[PDB]
């Protein structure tokens, strides 16, 4: 029933392949993004609760190394910041401001690393949402002109050789419109949820940096 | 049933999901409007009630029994004071260090209220985005299947194709129909939502300042 | 020639609501540009009148008689200074809390002032956000009626459906009428709102700082 490529010029086939697998890539990105975002979300409340669940400062670090490499999110931020904190503290590191700023350094850099490595493939969604109808319009208008120039070779409104051109026009515009929906479905919701992730990661940042501040002025 | 009800082959899903979003918007608008206005009125009611001579403990014990109807800004009040009582009673850390837990409590209560107040606003934006898109998704396919399945190759008698063209074009009209309520609802409740979490943030700062000041004295 | 008494009496209503929207938006542009220009003019005037080097008490004495006639930064300063003097007279147990009291008085005065200051802009945001959608719906309805009419004429002659399609094209053309002016005014005037509220913001923190240093010296 999908007799598309059998009767297809080079350009229509080009745009169709440029858009179909592109859309399936758009859904694959949806699946991966929602999976990782939900996984991080469920970890967020649990870890934040365990922050003040009676686990003293050192104990969380001592138990963190069990999953040292397979560590992510706020817990990974904790691991990096606190391990470099104790690295500095085991040395002289006499200046409290020095250790505090090193803590801020490590926390914010690890928080960034998590923010980007979780936040991937996202602007591609906006790009496709922008240019998918425009590519369809290209295919359609080229189909229009390709048949309209040929129309100037006959006299009567034959309408028999134009039908392939009409099919090309409809196919181009339809496939161009096809990818528009999932693009915007991804972009806004994913961006807002990632912004919430950034918000509570920042919360963790200033919170545990204040904790480390008070700890450094405590020891 | 003003003109037609034939419910063509793809019109079973197309135009049906569209009317589904339409009724969803038309119900969500009234529900959200009512609950948002009620939450607002209650919010400034508690706000201008807050500046009385009543101390925190008196209002807290007064509002202790409210419980189920204790929502809105009183939810943040009750939370923050509850964790304040828990941590202050357990004298084990610095007096200034209760503020982190208090901030946690107020912020999580704030997000809790924003969540169930927001509810479907993202969905309103979703329908506002997608209304014309699903409207024009199948309109081209309808005409394609109409004339590509034409009986004869030419069939100069083409008096029965234009009704099919209009029938296929129904999808664009009904799809874009839901766009107007969707966008209007989205933006027109968005500014109110901004007003909300702004004034709740103001109340949160009020609570933070009061508790930070009295923690060093009370 | 009006070319207006020819349609199905619904697209005509669409055109009426569109032209009414355009007129209302234009009037809003005039009014809000005028008031924004007046506020901008008053801004630097209060700026140099304040920081000419006169005492705060002298400035407040100049005010307190124009109370209901104050506007913008005048009202902001008057309200905050009134709260400052009130709290300082009353409490007398605020070594460093009067500054936050004055800051919050200033802040709530700013919040109400800005609630007053960009009242009608979201109307422009909405009308600019909706014009092409409603216009496209209108022309869709027009071409729908035109094609529904052409279902009996033999040979499917098309030149006789000219007026309906022509006025549908007018409907989409006039449908896009308020789209560009509305959004253009929206953006352009919102930029002015942003810069003015930034002026109010820097005003806010230097006023808070000078009150912080000066309040406890009495």
């Amino acid at each position: 029933i999908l007799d598309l490529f059998l009767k297809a010029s080079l350009l229509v086939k080009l745009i169709m392949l440029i858009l179909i697998g592109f859309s399936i890539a758009s859904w694959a990105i949806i699946i991966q993004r929602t999976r990782i975002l939900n996984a991080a979300a469920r970890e967020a409340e649990a870890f934040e609760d365990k922050f003040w669940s009676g686990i003293e400062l050192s104990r969380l670090y001592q138990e963190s190394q069990g999953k040292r490499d397979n560590l992510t999110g706020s817990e990974q931020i904790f691991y990096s910041g606190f391990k470099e904190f104790v690295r500095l503290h085991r040395a002289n590191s006499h200046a409290p401001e020095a250790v505090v700023e090193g803590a801020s350094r490590a926390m914010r850099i690890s928080m960034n690393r998590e923010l980007e490595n979780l936040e991937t493939h996202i602007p591609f969604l906006g790009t496709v949402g922008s240019i998918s109808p425009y590519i369809g319009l290209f295919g359609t208008v080229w189909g229009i002109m390709h048949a309209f120039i040929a129309l100037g070779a006959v006299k009567q409104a034959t309408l028999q050789m134009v039908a392939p051109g009409i099919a090309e026009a409809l196919i181009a515009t339809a496939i161009g419109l096809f990818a528009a929906i999932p693009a915007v479905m991804a972009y806004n919701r994913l961006n807002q949820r990632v912004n919430k992730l950034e918000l509570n990661y920042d919360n963790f940042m200033e919170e545990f940096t204040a904790i480390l501040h008070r700890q450094a002025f405590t020891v | 049933l003003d003109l037609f009800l034939k419910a063509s082959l793809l019109v079973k899903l197309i135009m049906l999901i569209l009317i589904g979003f339409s009724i969803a918007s038309w119900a969500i608008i009234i529900q959200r409007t009512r609950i948002l206005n009620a939450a607002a009125r209650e919010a400034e009611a508690f706000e201008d009630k807050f500046w009385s001579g009543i101390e925190l403990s008196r209002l807290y014990q007064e509002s202790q029994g409210k419980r189920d109807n204790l929502t809105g800004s009183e939810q943040i009040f009750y939370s923050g004071f509850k964790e304040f009582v828990r941590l202050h009673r357990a004298n084990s850390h610095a007096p200034e260090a209760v503020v982190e837990g208090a901030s946690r409590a107020m912020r999580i209560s704030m997000n809790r209220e924003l969540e169930n107040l927001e509810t479907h606003i993202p969905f309103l934006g979703t329908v506002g985005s997608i209304s014309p898109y699903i409207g024009l998704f199948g309109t081209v396919w309808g005409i394609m299947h109409a004339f590509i399945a034409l009986g004869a190759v030419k069939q100069a008698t083409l008096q029965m194709v234009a009704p099919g063209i209009a029938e296929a074009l129904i999808a664009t009209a009904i799809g874009l129909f839901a766009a107007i309520p969707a966008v209007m609802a989205y933006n027109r409740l968005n500014q109110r939502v901004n007003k909300l979490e702004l004034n709740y943030d103001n109340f949160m700062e009020e609570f933070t300042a009061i508790l930070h000041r009295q923690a060093f004295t009370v | 020639l009006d070319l207006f008494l020819k349609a199905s009496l619904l697209v005509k209503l669409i055109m009426l609501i569109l032209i009414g929207f355009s007129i209302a938006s234009w009037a809003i542009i005039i009014q809000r540009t005028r008031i924004l220009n007046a506020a901008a003019r008053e801004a630097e005037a209060f700026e140099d009148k304040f920081w000419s080097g006169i005492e705060l008490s002298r400035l407040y004495q100049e005010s307190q008689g124009k109370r209901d006639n104050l506007t913008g930064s005048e009202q902001i300063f008057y309200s905050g200074f009134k709260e400052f003097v009130r709290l300082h007279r009353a409490n007398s147990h605020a070594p460093e809390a009067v500054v936050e009291g004055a800051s919050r008085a200033m802040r709530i005065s700013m919040n109400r002032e800005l609630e007053n200051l960009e009242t009608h802009i979201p109307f422009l945001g909405t009308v600019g956000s909706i014009s092409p959608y409603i216009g496209l719906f209108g022309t869709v309805w027009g071409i729908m009626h035109a094609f529904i009419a052409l279902g009996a004429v033999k040979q499917a002659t098309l030149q006789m459906v000219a007026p309906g399609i022509a006025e549908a094209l007018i409907a989409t053309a006039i449908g896009l009428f308020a789209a560009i002016p509305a959004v253009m005014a929206y953006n352009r005037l919102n930029q002015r709102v942003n810069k003015l509220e930034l002026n109010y913001d820097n005003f806010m923190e230097e006023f808070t700082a000078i009150l912080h240093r000066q309040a406890f010296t009495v």
Binding site: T173 | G135, L136, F147, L158, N187 | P132, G135, L136
Partner: peptide, 23 residues
């Protein structure tokens, strides 16, 4: 919180008008 204009739906209808007017 939107500050943009969509033109795809507007132009698509006129495009379809042309395609049907081809025949």
């Amino acid at each position: 919180l939107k500050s943009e204009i969509n033109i795809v739906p507007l132009l698509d209808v006129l495009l379809v008008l042309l395609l049907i007017f081809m025949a």
